[PDB]
Design a binder for this molecule. Structure first.
Ligand SMILES: [Mg+2]
Ligand SMILES: [Mg+2]
Ligand SMILES: [Mg+2]
Ligand SMILES: [Mg+2]
Ligand SMILES: [Mg+2]
Ligand SMILES: [Mg+2]
Lengths: 99, 208, 99, 83
RNA sequence: UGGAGAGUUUGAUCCUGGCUCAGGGUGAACGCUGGCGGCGUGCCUAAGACAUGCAAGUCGUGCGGGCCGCGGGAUUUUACUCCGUGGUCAGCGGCGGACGGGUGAGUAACGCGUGGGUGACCUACCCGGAAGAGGGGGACAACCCGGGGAAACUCGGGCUAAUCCCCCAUGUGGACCCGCCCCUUGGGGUGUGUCCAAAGGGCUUUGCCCGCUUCCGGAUGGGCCCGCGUCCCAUCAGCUAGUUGGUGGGGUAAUGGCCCACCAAGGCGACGACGGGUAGCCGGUCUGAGAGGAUGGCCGGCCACAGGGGCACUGAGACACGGGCCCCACUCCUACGGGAGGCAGCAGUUAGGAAUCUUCCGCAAUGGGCGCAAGCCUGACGGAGCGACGCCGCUUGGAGGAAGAAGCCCUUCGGGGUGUAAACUCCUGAACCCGGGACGAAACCCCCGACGAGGGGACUGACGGUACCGGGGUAAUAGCGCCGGCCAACUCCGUGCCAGCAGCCGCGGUAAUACGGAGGGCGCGAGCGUUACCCGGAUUCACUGGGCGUAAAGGGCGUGUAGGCGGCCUGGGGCGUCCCAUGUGAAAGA
C-alpha cells in the first residue's frame, strides 16, 4: 500500500507545494524508552489550497520533483499554529548555537 | 595412533588396577599386587594433598585409559553427549560402551581391549555377516557381532572362545558360544557396569 | 590475437548509418510541419505532418526507434500542429486529425 | 527461456542432483525458482528418484524446456504419460 | 538444558582499580617432528607489472563466391562452355559475444537489507491464443582492377546473392490527435480522421518440418519511486545557485532540476545538515548463559569495477574484462611519419611479502551457446597433482614373559627407579606381490508406433586398471611441549645478579624442584609448540548489568530556551501497547 503519513504544514512559502512535518514514536532498539522522531516531507498542492497549521494526510506518489514524492490527500484539521510555533522556535534556537 | 608403550604401569599410577593386560593383570600382578603405587623415582614417596583440578583430571584419565581411546576422540564423544537428550555422564558411558573394539572384548572373543582392537583391524570380526575393521564402529542394539568364518580355525580364537564355555556375559549382551557369535541387546545403564570411576567429576573436568 | 567477431563492429557501423538517416528526416520533416502550422495552413501543414507520421511508424518496425518512442513523437507533433492551427484560423484538409 | 534441469549437490564421487526449475541464464548451482525433485545416479538408496509431477506439468504448461536428461528422468516417473 | 574463576598494590586486612592467565576460534604464518588414506581448502600484501598456451562461439536446412581435387555432359573435336560432387578459406546474413568466469578498487548511498509502490515502465529466446505472409524495386562485401603505407592497415573504381535494404498493397489488429463512456495519476472501452506488417529454407515433397509478421496474454528477467534499518570524529556547525519549487520544453521503455529556457525565493541542519576519516552490503561465520561483541575467506544473493579518466555506437538488453572512440600513464614494433596492446578467466612468470599450488586429464557426467540433427565450442565444470593448511578415520603390533638381565639415573651403600619395559616363546599379518575388477550411463540418436504416449535397439568412462572382492604375505615410525605458583608433573650434577629464564607474579649473588645437561615424571600424539588477530572470562561502557562525601567522578551560583518528565475524576479517538488470522521470512547453513 502507498504509505499514508499525517503531519502539519510548516511552510507554504513555495508555489503548489507545502512542507509537511511528520512525527513518529517508538521503542528504542536497546534502551527501551519510547522516543520521538520527525521528518519534513515536501508534498504536492496543485490548488495552493492548504496553508499554515493545517494537519493533513500525505500519500506516496509517482514523483512530482527532486524530492516531491507525496501528495496532500486530505485535510484533517485546521489551526495548529502551536505546532508550527513549536517547530519555528526550534529553528530560531539554532541561531545562538554557533561560534 | 592410540597409546603403545608400558601399560600394567597404569594398572598402577591411576591408583586402581585397570584391566589392560587381560589374563596376566588377573594373576599375582596387574603389578598392582606387587606394587600398588605410582611409577618412577618418586613413586612411593609421601603423597601430596592434591588440587580439585588434579583430582578431576586423574578421574577422566582413568576412564579414558580404561577403554584405550584418545583424548581427541574421547572429548568429542563427550561433547556429543552434552548436546544429546538425557543425563549426560551415563549417555557417554553408553556411547563409550557401544564401540566395536570393546563389545568384541565384552563378549570375550579377546582377553584385552588392546588385543580386541587388533582383531577388528585385522579383519577377523563381523557385524551381521559383513566384515568390519574400524575399532571405533558404533554397535547399535540388535546387531550381531560374529567371528570370521575364515578365522574360526585360529589357535587364538579357539583358546579364547573355549574359556567362555562356562563364563557369564553382560546383561545387555548375549553369546552363542559354539556358533562363535553374540549380540548387542541394548545400551547399558550406569548400574550395569562396575567402573572404578565417578563420572560426575568428568563432566566437571570439562566445565572449565 | 585475432577474434573474427569484430565482424560485429563492421555491422554496427552500418546500422548506425541506416539509423541516423531515418531519424534526421523525421526531424527536418516534423520541424517543417509545426512551422507551416504557426502560419495557418490547411493541406500543406497536415500533408507533411502525415508524411512525418508514416516515417515514424516505419522506423518503429526496425531497431531504429522502435516502440512508442514512436508514439511519443507522433503525439508531440500532432498535438502542436493542431494547437498552433486553432491559435489562428483554418481547420481544413481533414488529413491526420480526428476533427 | 526457463528450464527444468539438474543442479549438482552431494559431494566428490557422490553426485546428487536436484531437479529444479530456473532461468536458463543462471549458473548451475545458483538460485532456482522451485525444487521439483531429486535424483541419485548410483541408485545407492531404494528411493533414488522422485518428482513432484503435478508441479512439473505446471511449468511445462507455462513453457519451460527441460534439459534432455531432465526430461528422461521426468519420463521415468511418467510426467508425459497420458490416459 | 543455561552462567566456575585464578595470580598481582599491604607487615597483615577490607575495598576500589588496572594488568595477566586458564577456553574457544583462524584463508594463517614460523620451530622441531613427520607413516597411510578420505572429504574440504590454499595471494589476507602491490586493484603492481606480466612471456607462452588455452579460456566464445557456432549455423551450408539464410546467400553468393575464391582456391585445390574427382565425376559426368554439349562436339565428334578438344579451345570454349552446362550439371554434379568432395576438400578448404574467409565474406555477406542470423543467434550467441550483456550469460558463464574474476576481483573488492571505488561506495556511508535507496549501494545493501527489509517491507511496499509502479494509473510511471521494458523484457530476445520459451509457452498459450487470434489473424497474416499478395506484387514490385534497390545496394554493399565476397570476387576483379587500380593507387597510398615500413607495418597496422587504408582510398578509390567495377560485378553480385539472400532470412540484407526500401517502395505499394491486404489491416486480424495495434499507434497517435479529438470526442464520449466506465475507471480513477498515463487503467479499460469506444467513434470518425491519419498512420504501420511479413522471409524464406528443407524434404521421407500438395503435407509435413524449421522458420517469418501484427496483436492480447502468460512465464522468466529487470528499470525507476517510497517507509524503516545500516561505522567513527562536533577538536567538522552552519550547508546550498540546478541550489528548493513553478510553468513550458527536451530526453527516456518510463517518473523526476535527468537536462534546458523563462518566473518565484526557496530547500537542508543539534532527531547532527555540511566537512573529515574508515568500509562493498546480506544469507550467515566465530564467540557468548544470554543480551551482546567481532566478522563478511570459502558456498549462495544483491552491488560495483575490468591500467587511470571521459564518451557514445550496436542492440531485447551494454554505455559492454577477452567490442568501439579520445585524453593520461606504462610496455613493445617502427623505414621516426606512425602503429600494436591490457590475466581483478585457467595454468604459469616476476615483484612486494611471514605466506598461498600444476604452464596437469577429460568434455565420460551436470550446466551453458549455436545447429532440425549428426555434431562443433565451453580452463563453466568433472577429475587428478602439490601443501598435516582444516576436519574425520587408521598403522608403528597382540598374548605370554623375573621378586626383575644389562646399561643409565638416584642411594642412610642395606637399596630404590626406568620395568613386563626389553631379551626371548608362540599369534595376527600395515606395507608389498599375484589374480579378478566397478557404480557413476541412459538419453540425445536409430527402428515400431504418429516426429506424440509407450515399446525396442545401439554408441559413449577423464577419474582408472582406481575403489572394492579373492589369494599370498613381512613385527614393521615417534615426536613436541611442559614439571616454582596460577597448572597435571622432582631429584643429581653443572653454573654463581655470571651465563641465562620470564604470559603475570618473579627465578640467578656456591646447595637453584624457576637457568643448562642428565635420569625420572606430567600432557598431547602424526603431531606438538610459538607469534599475530577475534569473542570470552571483563557486571572493566553496566539494556539485561556499574557508578560520583574521603577511591576516577556534582557543573562556582543562578536565570531560564529547546528537550525529557507530569496530580484526582469522567468522556471521545485508538497513535504508543496487547491479541487473532493471513502474506513475507529463497536455497545452503544451524
Ligand atoms: Mg608484599
Ligand atoms: Mg564520508
Ligand atoms: Mg624453560
Ligand atoms: Mg562486556
Ligand atoms: Mg556544588
Ligand atoms: Mg530552572
Amino acid at each position: 500500500p502507498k504509505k499514508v503519513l499525517t503531519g502539519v504544514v510548516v511552510s507554504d512559502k513555495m508555489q503548489k507545494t507545502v512542507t509537511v512535518l511528520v512525527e513518529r514514536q517508538f521503542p528504542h532498539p536497546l534502551y527501551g524508552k519510547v522516543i520521538k522522531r520527525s521528518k519534513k516531507y515536501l508534498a504536492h498542492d496543485p490548488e495552493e489550497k492548504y496553508k499554515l497549521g493545517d494537519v493533513v494526510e500525505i500519500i506516496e506518489s509517482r514523483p512530482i520533483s527532486k524530492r516531491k514524492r507525496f501528495r496532500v490527500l486530505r485535510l484533517v484539521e485546521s489551526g495548529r499554529m502551536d505546532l508550527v510555533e513549536k517547530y519555528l522556535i526550534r529553528r530560531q534556537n539554532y541561531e545562538s548555537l554557533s561560534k | 595412533g592410540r597409546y603403545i608403550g608400558p601399560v600394567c604401569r597404569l594398572c598402577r599410577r591411576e591408583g586402581v588396577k585397570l584391566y589392560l593386560k587381560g589374563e596376566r593383570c588377573y594373576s599375582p600382578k596387574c603389578a598392582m599386587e606387587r606394587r600398588p603405587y605410582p611409577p618412577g623415582q618418586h613413586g612411593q614417596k609421601r603423597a601430596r594433598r592434591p588440587s580439585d583440578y588434579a583430582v578431576r583430571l586423574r578421574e577422566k584419565q582413568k576412564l579414558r585409559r580404561i577403554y584405550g581411546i584418545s583424548e581427541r576422540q574421547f572429548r568429542n564423544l563427550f561433547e556429543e553427549a552434552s548436546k544429546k537428550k538425557g543425563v549426560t555422564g551415563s549417555v557417554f558411558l553408553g556411547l563409550l560402551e557401544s564401540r566395536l573394539d570393546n563389545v568384541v572384548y565384552r563378549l570375550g572373543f579377546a582377553v584385552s581391549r588392546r588385543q580386541a582392537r587388533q582383531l577388528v583391524r585385522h579383519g577377523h570380526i563381523t557385524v551381521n555377516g559383513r566384515r568390519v575393521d574400524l575399532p571405533s564402529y558404533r554397535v547399535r542394539p540388535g546387531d550381531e557381532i560374529a567371528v570370521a568364518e575364515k578365522s574360526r580355525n585360529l589357535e587364538l580364537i579357539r583358546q579364547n572362545l573355549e574359556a567362555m564355555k562356562g563364563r557369564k556375559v553382560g546383561p545387555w549382551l548375549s553369546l552363542d558360544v559354539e556358533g562363535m557369535k553374540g549380540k548387542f541387546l541394548r545400551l547399558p545403564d550406569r548400574e550395569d557396569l562396575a567402573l572404578p570411576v565417578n563420572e560426575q567429576l568428568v563432566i566437571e573436568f570439562y566445565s572449565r | 590475437r585475432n577474434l573474427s567477431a569484430l565482424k560485429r563492429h563492421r555491422q554496427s557501423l552500418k546500422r548506425r548509418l541506416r539509423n541516423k538517416a531515418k531519424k534526421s528526416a523525421i526531424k527536418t520533416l516534423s520541424k517543417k510541419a509545426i512551422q507551416l502550422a504557426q502560419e495557418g495552413k490547411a493541406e500543406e501543414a497536415l500533408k507533411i505532418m502525415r508524411k512525418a507520421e508514416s516515417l515514424i511508424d516505419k522506423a518503429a518496425k526496425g531497431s531504429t526507434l522502435h516502440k512508442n518512442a514512436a508514439a511519443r513523437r507522433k503525439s508531440r507533433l500532432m498535438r502542436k500542429v493542431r494547437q498552433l492551427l486553432e491559435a489562428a484560423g483554418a481547420p481544413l484538409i481533414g488529413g491526420g486529425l480526428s476533427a | 527461456m526457463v528450464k527444468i534441469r539438474l543442479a549438482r549437490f552431494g559431494s566428490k564421487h557422490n553426485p546428487h542432483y536436484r531437479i529444479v526449475v530456473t532461468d536458463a541464464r543462471r549458473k548451475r548451482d545458483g538460485k532456482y525458482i522451485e525444487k521439483i525433485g531429486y535424483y541419485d545416479p548410483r541408485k545407492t538408496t531404494p528411493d533414488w528418484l522422485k518428482v513432484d509431477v503435478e508441479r512439473a506439468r505446471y511449468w511445462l504448461s507455462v513453457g519451460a524446456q527441460p534439459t534432455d536428461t531432465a526430461r528422461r528422468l521426468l519420463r521415468q516417473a511418467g510426467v508425459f504419460r497420458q490416459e
